[PDB]
Amino acid sequence: DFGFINYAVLFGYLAAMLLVGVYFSKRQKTADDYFRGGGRVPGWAAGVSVFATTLSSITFMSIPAKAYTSDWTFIIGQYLAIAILPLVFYFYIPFFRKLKITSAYEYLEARFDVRSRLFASLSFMLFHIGRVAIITYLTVLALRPFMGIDPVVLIVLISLLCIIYTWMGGIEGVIWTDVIQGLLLSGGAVLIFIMICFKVDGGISEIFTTTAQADKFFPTTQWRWSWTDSTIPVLMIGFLFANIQQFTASQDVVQRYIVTDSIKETKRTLITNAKLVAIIPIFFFAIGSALFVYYQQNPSLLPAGFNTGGILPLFIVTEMPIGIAGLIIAAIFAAAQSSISSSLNSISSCFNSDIYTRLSKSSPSPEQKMKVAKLVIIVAGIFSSLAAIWLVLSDWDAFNSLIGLMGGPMTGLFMLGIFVKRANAGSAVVGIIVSIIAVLAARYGSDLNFFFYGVIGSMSVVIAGTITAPLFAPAKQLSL
Ligand SMILES: CCCCCCCCCCCCO[C@@H]1O[C@H](CO)[C@@H](O[C@H]2O[C@H](CO)[C@@H](O)[C@H](O)[C@H]2O)[C@H](O)[C@H]1O
Ligand SMILES: CC(=O)N[C@H]1[C@H]([C@H](O)[C@H](O)CO)O[C@](O)(C(=O)O)C[C@@H]1O
Ligand code: NA
Ligand code: NA
Numbered sequence: 001d002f003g004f005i006n007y008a009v010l011f012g013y014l015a016a017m018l019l020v021g022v023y024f025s026k027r028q029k030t031a032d033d034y035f036r037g038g039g040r041v042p043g044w045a046a047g048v049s050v051f052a053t054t055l056s057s058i059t060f061m062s063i064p065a066k067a068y069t070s071d072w073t074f075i076i077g078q079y080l081a082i083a084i085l086p087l088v089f090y091f092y093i094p095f096f097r098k099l100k101i102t103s104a105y106e107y108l109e110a111r112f113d114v115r116s117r118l119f120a121s122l123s124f125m126l127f128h129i130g131r132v133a134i135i136t137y138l139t140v141l142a143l144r145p146f147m148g149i150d151p152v153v154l155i156v157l158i159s160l161l162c163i164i165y166t167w168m169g170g171i172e173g174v175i176w177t178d179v180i181q182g183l184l185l186s187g188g189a190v191l192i193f194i195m196i197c198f199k200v201d202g203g204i205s206e207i208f209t210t211t212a213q214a215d216k217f218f219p220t221t222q223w224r225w226s227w228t229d230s231t232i233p234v235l236m237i238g239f240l241f242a243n244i245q246q247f248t249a250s251q252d253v254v255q256r257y258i259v260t261d262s263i264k265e266t267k268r269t270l271i272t273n274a275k276l277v278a279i280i281p282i283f284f285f286a287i288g289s290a291l292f293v294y295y296q297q298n299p300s301l302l303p304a305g306f307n308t309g310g311i312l313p314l315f316i317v318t319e320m321p322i323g324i325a326g327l328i329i330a331a332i333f334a335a336a337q338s339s340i341s342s343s344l345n346s347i348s349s350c351f352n353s354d355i356y357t358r359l360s361k362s363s364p365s366p367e368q369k370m371k372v373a374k375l376v377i378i379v380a381g382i383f384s385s386l387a388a389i390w391l392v393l394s395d396w397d398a399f400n401s402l403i404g405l406m407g408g409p410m411t412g413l414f415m416l417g418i419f420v421k422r423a424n425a426g427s428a429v430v431g432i433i434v435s436i437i438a439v440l441a442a443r444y445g446s447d448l449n450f451f452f453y454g455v456i457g458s459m460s461v462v463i464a465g466t467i468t469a470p471l472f473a474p475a476k477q478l479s480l
Contacts, residue, residue, distance in 0.1 A: 001148045002317070006326030013184075013330035014161055017177050017337065021165030024173035031369035034170040035102050035349040039261040041175055043268025046256045049175040049342070050269060051276040052182030053252050056131075056339035057139045059284060060185065060332055064312045067288025071216045073232050077239035078281045081246070082274045088247050089270055091418055093257050097266070098480050103353035104254040111417035111478055113425040114358070119432055120413060121354035123406035124251050128343040129380060130400040132159075133387035135343075139336040140392055143329065145310065146317040151392045158336055159388060163381035166341040167374060171259060171349075174341045181334030186276065188331030189283040192312075195320060196290035201297055210296070211289045228449050238451025241411065241458050248418075249411040251346040291315055344384070348376035405443055408457015409435035415458060416465040423465045426472030431465030 028034050041049075066074060095107055105124070109117035136159050140151055147154060166174055197204045211217060222231045230238075247253055260266045291311055295302055306314075316328050352373050357364060364372070390396070409432050416423045416431060423431075438460045442448050448456075469475070 002146065002326070002329075003322060005322050006329065009323060009326030010330050010333070013327075013333065014157065016180070018161065018165050020177050020180070021167075021169035021173045024170055024176065025168040027172065028168075028170045028370070030366045031102065031352060031373050033172075034370060034373045035255070035345070035352065037170070037172045037175065037259040039259070040172065041259040043260050043265035044272045045175055045179050046259050046265075046269040047272025048182040048276065049178035049338075050253055050256045050273040051280070052178040052185070052334075052338035053256070053342040054246060054339070055182075055185065055280075055335060056135045057142065057332060057336040058135065059281070060189075060335040061138060061142050061309060061312060063281065063284035064288035064291065065309045067216070067285040068292045068311055069288075069308050071219055071222070072285045072289075073218060073222055073230075074235060074239075075281060075285055076232065076236055077243070078277050080236065080239050081243040082277055084240070084243055084247060085270045085274055089267065092248050092414070093263075093266060094480055095418070095478075096254060096257050097263070101254075101258055101353075103350045104249070104251050105350065105354050108413055108417065108428075109358075111476065112413070112423075112428045116413050116425070116428045116432070117354060117358075119406075120249070120410045121350045123403065123410050125347050125350050125380075126399075126403045127407060128252065128347050129384055129387070130403060132340050132343050132380075132384035133391060134400070135336050135339050136384070136388035137391040139332065140388070142310070142313045142332065146313060152389065155385060155388055155392070158333065159340065159381070159385045162337045162340045163344065163377065163385075166344050167377045167381075171255065171345055174345050175256070175259065177341060178338045181338035182276070184334040185331045185338075186280045186283075188328050188334075189280060189287065191324070192316070192320075192328060193283050193286050193290060195324075196287065196294055196315065199319060200290065200294050207286075207290050207293045210293045214292075216289060216292070226449065227452075228447050230449055230451060234449055234451045237455055238449075241408070241454040244415070244458070245407050245411040245454060249407075249414045251350055252342045255342075255346055255349060287312065340384075344377050344380055347380045348373050351376045401443070405439040405453055405457065406436075408439055408454045409461050411454070412458040412461025412465070416462050420462070420466050420469070422469040422475050424469055424472050424475040427465040427469040428461070430468045431461035431463075434464040435460035 027038070032038060063074070096104065099106060099110060101107065103121060105117045105121040108120055136155060139158050140154050144151055144154060165177060169177070197207060200207055223233070224231050225233055256269055257266060260269055294315070295311065302311075316325060320328060352369060356372050357369065412431060412435060413428060416428060435457050439453055439457045442453055442456050
């Protein structure tokens with residue numbers, strides 16, 4: 001078994017997350033508290049929270065498996081995510097801040113009209129219900145063979161517990177848990193790397209040389225155009241657009257831009273996040289390369305037909321010492337939970353502003369907004385968790401892959417509003433329609449690589465919403 005000591009580390013970590021939630025529950029009086037944090041978050045904390053929100057068990061498990069089986073080409077993705085940040089700061093964040101947004105999609109009603117706002121908000125909320133279910137599913141897939149408990153108990157520990165502290169704690173409790181979880185997964189990744197270096201005969205130098213000799217850093221055979229394969233050009237355009245989605249059009253990140261009290265602290269949020277993205281992800285790639293060298297030096301330690309997605313967890317549970325092993329498991333929990341908590345709170349912030357407030361005939365009182373803010377964390381939590389239970393016990397993708405395609409059009413709407421002065425409500429709507437059709441064509445009637453779905457979706461809104469602008473009444477002004 002995992003053992004009592006390893007467990008006690010895990011349950012200490014879980015108890016610490018709940019206690020942070022209890023601490024921040026006292027200050028939740030209004031929706032402003034619960035979603036905007038009353039302007040009490042410093043920049044550095046919001047920036048760690050952005051990193052921990054975006055980096056989930058998807059990165060933690062997949063990126064090492066990917067470097068193990070192939071190469072580091074995907075890391076170009078991380079650096080493109082940093083490269084766009086000044087553009088976000090200069091062109092997007094001033095609108096978000098000056099409008100005193102609760103939900104990012106309020107910008108779309110201000111720039112265009114309610115149809116664009118609601119299309120984007122519903123696509124966000126549905127996508128993130130999926131992201132939570134997926135994050136929870138992968139974590140369970142990773143840990144289940146090695147914990148000695150039923151999948152459902154594991155879901156209680158990963159998901160239910162996360163729901164409780166998120167519910168009590170508001171965006172402040174979500175952010176301060178994220179800071180701990182962000183730093184825990186970061187040190188955890190560094191510590192895994194170190195340990196694998198100490199177990200490879202020849203250490204870090206042999207890990208480097210073997211990897212470079214196998215052409216597993218940046219193979220030039222991947223510098224080629226393709227419509228179907230995930231080559232360097234495809235993933236560069238693909239990650240550029242995914243990153244623009246993540247940092248301009250996605251409520252879980254955009255929410256962190258408005259919790260700081262000044263633009264000075266807002267810059268600190270982006271700067272802190274940039275430092276983490278420039279340093280930490282490299283360790284996840286380095287881990288897959290290290291493990292590859294380690295299991296080439298120790299061929300009999302893998303069962304034949306072992307799934308390469310389980311090699312990292314296999315190494316943790318079989319090769320890391322007692323206490324340390326329990327802490328790495330807590331760090332995988334921390335990668336999952338920091339993303340789950342942010343997605344639940346953002347889902348509730350969108351529901352509160354874009355659905356409940358915007359569509360009520362009269363404006364809800366402060367006390368009413370607070371109630372619904374809390375309630376939607378439970379409801380979304382329940383739905384996300386059931387889905388995760390279904391994914392586990394059965395062996396669905398349709399809904400998820402379908403709603404995922406709406407990320408492109410949501411992101412195009414922001415690019416169009418922000419950069420095309422003549423675009424207007426109607427031309428944005430023609431843009432959505434064109435975008436939707438184009439993405440369904442890409443996904444279901446072609447063999448195009450998945451990296452193209454976002455670019456197509458985005459650029460379809462931009463192009464159709466630009467060329468059809470003169471057919472509708474002149475654009476709303478919106479002067480900041
Ligand atoms: C998915 C692919 C589809 C893309 C095909 C291109 C679609 C382009 C549509 C262009 C026509 C838009 O239709 C829009 O209709 C309203 C009524 O419908 C027009 O009407 C508006 O202006 C006119 C000016 O005379 C007024 O008489 C009218 O009362 C007012 O509402 C808008 O000026 C026009 O902008
Ligand atoms: C460029 C890239 O790989 N982006 C990935 C990011 C980054 O790894 C992370 O934000 C650190 O920069 O993590 C995810 O959002 C995640 O783990 O759920 C998946 C996404 O595909
Ligand atoms: Na996370
Ligand atoms: Na979070």
